[PDB]
């Protein structure tokens, strides 16, 4: 079927803050991509093969709030710009791509999927250039192949004059090596 | 929750309408030049491209607009009035083959529905089923470019 996505806000500003400090989240989890926040910035996190991966430039070395209190990161790789925690209970995991396709689809924090043409192991180009403002908050989001499998996690926008024309991502391979580290 | 696809009806038949770029498009052979109902009275068609079997009214309430495709994929998906998804391989400008033919009844009442690409973006509007002995094996469709041209 075609890739479709929807977004749902499960928590607000004040509840987010209290939860950040407390580190205890009793809310139920659903979905394969979680919208995530710290008191400083908001980004995305993607569950692949049972691990909730996200961008290090967003999560830093922080723990993730869970119903059992904060959870310590399973993987941290400042270089790869990755962090991973055990996937929250209730989440659904994506599976790594096994077809090396060059036609990728980026899911933004607004639940939109945009086509991206793979131009390297970690780069791809937007078929329809969007302003980086639209991409703000999407670091850590998934880059899916036509089969709905994870190819990479969005990391940075390649833009000029404020218009994103390409994107840099973390290919799934970096995940396997980072876990091995 | 807002829908991109509206299930519509006239006294004669029932079909589908698809919201793309703020317009609620459907097939002329279903809507004709009929006006669409709203809580404030009938609203007239913004476009009536009889030649392309295309009509459009301003997007109604409870709907959200679909985005046109830009990946040029040939791997299309047809959404029926029953919410069924059907893989269709694009054969040309406005033709495609069902990866698995179904009785025309399975595609019955879905005209006006959308033809989507691997990213869920609008590729075209389902115009007519191409039958062979009551089995739909291909479909005719109005490319999004035509909708974009009509407006």
């Amino acid at each position: 079927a075609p890739i479709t996505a929807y977004a749902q806000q499960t928590r607000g500003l004040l509840g987010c803050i209290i939860t950040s400090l407390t580190g205890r989240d009793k809310n139920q989890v659903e979905g394969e991509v979680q919208i995530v926040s710290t008191a400083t910035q908001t980004f995305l996190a993607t569950c692949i093969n049972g691990v909730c991966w996200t961008v290090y430039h967003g999560a830093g070395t922080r723990t993730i709030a869970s119903p059992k209190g904060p959870v310590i990161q399973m993987y941290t790789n400042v270089d790869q710009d990755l962090v991973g925690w055990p996937a929250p209970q209730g989440s659904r995991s994506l599976t790594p791509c096994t077809c090396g396709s060059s036609d990728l689809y980026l899911v933004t924090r607004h639940a939109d999927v945009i086509p991206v043409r793979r131009r390297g192991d970690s780069r791809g180009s937007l078929l329809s250039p969007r302003p980086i403002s639209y991409l703000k908050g999407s670091s850590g989001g998934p880059l899916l192949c036509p089969a709905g499998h994870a190819v990479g996690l969005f990391r940075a926008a390649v833009c000029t004059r404020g218009v994103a024309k390409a994107v840099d991502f973390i290919p799934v391979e970096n995940l396997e090596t980072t876990m091995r580290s | 929750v807002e829908g991109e696809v509206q299930i519509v009806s006239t006294a004669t038949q029932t079909f589908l309408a698809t919201c793309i770029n703020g317009v609620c498009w459907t097939v002329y052979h279903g809507a004709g030049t009929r006006t669409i109902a709203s809580p404030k009275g009938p609203v007239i068609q913004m476009y009536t491209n009889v030649d392309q079997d295309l009509v459009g009214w301003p997007a109604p309430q409870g709907s959200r607009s679909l985005t046109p495709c830009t990946c040029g994929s040939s791997d299309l998906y047809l959404v029926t009035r029953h919410a069924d998804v059907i893989p269709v391989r694009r054969r040309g400008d406005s033709r495609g083959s069902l990866l698995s033919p179904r009785p025309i009844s399975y595609l019955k009442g879905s005209s006006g529905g959308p033809l989507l690409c691997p990213a869920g973006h609008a590729v075209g509007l389902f115009r007519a089923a191409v039958c062979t002995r009551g089995v739909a094996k291909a479909v005719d469709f109005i490319p999004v470019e035509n909708l974009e041209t009509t407006m």
């Binding site: 929807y6 | 829908g3 696809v5 009806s9 006294a11 309408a17 669409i36």
Partner: peptide
């Protein structure tokens, strides 16, 4: 007559 809306489909399968 008018074309009336009798139902709606959400492509993402979004609840509520």
């Amino acid at each position: 007559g008018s074309v009336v809306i009798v139902g709606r489909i959400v492509l993402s399968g979004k609840p509520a």
